[PDB]
Symmetry: C2
Subunit: 255 residues, 2 copies
């Protein structure tokens, strides 16, 4: 009852701030959509309203079948490269949703695929995490022996690790995405945080743009960066779990 009574208000205030940060933009977007609707109607008096509804229905009929509304459909295709990373988005609980199964045969295969892969992959990432943590800790302790160990040395190593993670996964990438994707900084940072926390809305996906000249290995570099980010996330979350025991001990000292 101590947590729910705070998270209820957390959701309330989140909604209260989102409703004012976003609603003006949504209203102006709807108004512009309807204005351009009527102005396309007046541009083609030859085209009737009840035909515009048919065109809209056709466009929405296959925008949820997989084919993109505009341009070519090479990046949302179902061939080997796209599928090998759709599998990854499935088994890392990210689930962007730009490509998803649309057949009763596949929709049922994806269930067992997730049920058998997600628990496996969440261990592989933890294994990578513990291995890299062992390497970092042995290097740090060797260099601390070459120096002097300190009661605050663990503070130094932990802070170095945390700042390494923050730099590599929230402050450096947005510039790479400014360069190769032509997003501004806020978009790149927002997308990086969304992807790292396995939220994955699916409005910003890296390496999928018909109007782009990506290098042949850009997508796989993105995927590898995502995997390393998830591994560091596992390491830091276990470290913070243990440091929470530490601080719940140290609090009684203050009493």
């Amino acid at each position: 009852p101590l947590l729910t009574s705070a998270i209820i208000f957390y959701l309330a205030i989140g909604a209260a701030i989102f409703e004012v940060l976003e609603e003006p933009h949504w209203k102006e977007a709807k108004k512009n959509y309807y204005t351009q609707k009527l102005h396309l109607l007046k541009e083609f008096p030859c085209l009737s309203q009840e035909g515009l509804d048919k065109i809209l229905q056709v466009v929405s009929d296959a925008a949820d079948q997989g084919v993109a509304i505009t341009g070519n459909q090479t990046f949302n295709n179902w061939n080997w490269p796209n599928a090998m990373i759709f599998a990854a988005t499935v088994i890392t609980t990210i689930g962007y949703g730009n490509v998803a199964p649309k057949t009763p045969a596949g929709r049922l295969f994806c269930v067992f695929y997730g049920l058998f892969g997600v628990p496996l992959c969440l261990t592989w990432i933890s294994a990578l995490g513990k291995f890299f943590g062992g390497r970092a800790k042995r290097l740090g302790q060797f260099l601390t022996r070459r120096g002097v160990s300190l009661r605050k040395a663990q503070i130094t190593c932990t802070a170095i690790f945390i700042v390494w993670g923050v730099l590599v996964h929230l402050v450096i990438p947005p510039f790479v995405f400014m360069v190769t994707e032509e997003w501004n900084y806020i978009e790149g940072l927002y997308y990086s945080f969304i992807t790292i926390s396995t939220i994955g809305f699916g409005d910003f996906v890296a390496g999928v743009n018909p109007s782009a000249n990506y290098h042949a290995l850009y997508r796989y570099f993105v995927e590898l960066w995502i995997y390393l980010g998830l591994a560091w996330l596992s390491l830091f979350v276990n470290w913070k779990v243990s440091m929470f025991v530490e601080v719940h001990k140290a609090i009684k000292k203050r009493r």
Copy 2:
């Protein structure tokens, strides 16, 4: 090491089976799209190709800003009811993506909102899990004392727990969704699993349809069911960690 090769083979075979399962349907979908695309121009020779491209462009502008392509647009609105459940999907790492921020001011608020809420919510769910597990094991041990305790009573109680979870979260819900949402069974089961594992593609959301006569509490009942499912998931994953620690020794019994 040992896990990475298995993961790579898993990704390869998953990509193969997905490509063979989905590619025919995807190809026929886009072929039908292009067929009706030309059929529209056939219906309106008065309409031109470039007019069609401008219409498609205007429509593709909508799906980005958030305004829906067709029909009534109340369920994707940004008022209080939608905003509360959007904050929920943000702080449970589900992230459907049917509604998302589109302003640089909000896109940056969502980052700090997630960073401060997701670690909080992942504890509240663990708290609910541990509390319900305490209550359930308490009742089970009381009723086992009233009867007789057994060396395999853990098997009984744990299997009862697991079947309770599976039933209430993957086998019963699809019928409720058959009734109130008019999906078939495979869609409902797929959606239930993909929501329980915090994947959340965002093609099936329960409670958003302009052509619906939902009851005023349907959406919040769905959200509460989702939260209880996540709590049971926490309980079961902790149980799995414990039983796996157990079997890592129990294997030597077979040796």
